[PDB]
Design a protein around this ligand. Sequence first.
Ligand code: 5VT
Length: 218
Amino acid sequence: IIDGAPCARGSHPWQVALLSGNQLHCGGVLVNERWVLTAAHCKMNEYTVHLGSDTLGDRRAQRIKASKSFRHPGYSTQTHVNDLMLVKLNSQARLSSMVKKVRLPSRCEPPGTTCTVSGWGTTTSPDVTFPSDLMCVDVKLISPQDCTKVNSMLCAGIPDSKKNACNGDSGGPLVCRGTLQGLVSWGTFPCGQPNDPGVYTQVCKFTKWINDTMKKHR
Ligand SMILES: COc1ccc(CCNC(=O)[C@@H]2CCCN2C(=O)NCc2cccc3ccccc23)cc1
């Protein structure tokens, strides 16, 4: 996350990280005790999922192996369309005040809405600097028609501001008015240029796919 600040402790109990061993790979969200939602670009042969702490490596965090994952069938490596994936945990996440199911959307929040994006991705660019504490930044929703770099994607940013997501933030949540509205997808490199908004998968357009994919892989 660029030009953000540490998230208030305990305010992201539905946030997870996908690690390759102990190395950050992507963000994600906990859908339920057996499933994580992330970006399709995050695909790996297997994952270690971090839950239950704003600090990576925290001895109190839960770590769970996840062997299986399922991309949305329309995913394009070139256009970034359909950049979402479900990761099946090998063992159930233990729920508590620090591990909670995310609130999925029932409606699409419109352009102009203030939202928050969070992650453990780099805070600098092009030099990488990975924070241990989960970082947050507030950004405003931008229609894909108003987003020069781009019907199921959104952009988000603040006019004349560097605030954005970066490497390591893919798959993490963009939340608005208490619901999940986006997953970080992609943007310009180097990160953090003003008026260069990041692109997100618009979660409200994938309700059916998320529910059905989980039901088809019980
Ligand atoms: C030691 O150096 C290291 C260590 C680890 C890594 C892999 C770390 N993870 C990844 O970059 C993930 C993987 C899938 C795509 N990713 C994004 O975060 N994309 C999101 C993304 C990437 C670049 C610019 C962006 C601008 C705006 C919004 C999103 C952007 C790299 C260098």
